[PDB]
Amino acid sequence: ADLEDNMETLNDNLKVIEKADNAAQVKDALTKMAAAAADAWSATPPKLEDKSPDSPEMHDFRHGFWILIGQIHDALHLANEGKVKEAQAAAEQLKTTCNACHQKYR
């Protein structure tokens, strides 16, 4: 529930998806990711600790989780359509969204 644990869950489940052999394994990992991002939403990263809760930076930080949550859902839908490799590929591409936030706020 702290920001570290949420980030590990995100990281770990990205690796679970990469190594997965069926759609159920992918779905489970993706829902775990979504829950971690949702929980991360209310956090203040150390580098934005001096900004007000409703500053543009804090809004944008939260928006970074918003984008990720949408994209995790896109990958979930691919898995439900039986597109295992495509869902795995979509999950890998999530790193772009991971990195976008890290570059600004980590």
The binding site consists of: 7, 102
State yes or no: residue 23 binds a second copy (CB under 8 A): no
C-alpha 103/C-alpha 101 separation (Å) is 5
Query: Which are the contacts of 42, defined by CB distance < 8 A and separation ≥ 6?
Result: none
Query: Which are the contacts of 39, defined by CB distance < 8 A and separation ≥ 6?
Result: 1, 6
Q: What is the dihedral of CA 19, 22, 23, 28, to 10 degrees?
A: -60
Sign, CA dihedral 49-38-77-63, equals negative
State yes or no: residue 31 binds a second copy (CB under 8 A): yes
Interacting positions 12-31 with Cl ion (CB under 5 A): 22-23
What is the smallest separation between the CB atom of 101 and Cl ion, expressed in angstroms? 15
Interacting positions 9-68 with ligand HEM (CB under 6 A): 10-11, 14, 45-46, 61, 64-65, 68
Closer to ligand HEM by CB, 76 or 82: give it.
Answer: 76
Closer to ligand HEM by CB, 80 or 93: give it.
Answer: 93
Residues within the interface to a second copy (CB under 8 A) = 28, 31, 34-35, 38-39, 41-42, 54, 59, 62, 65-66, 69-70, 73
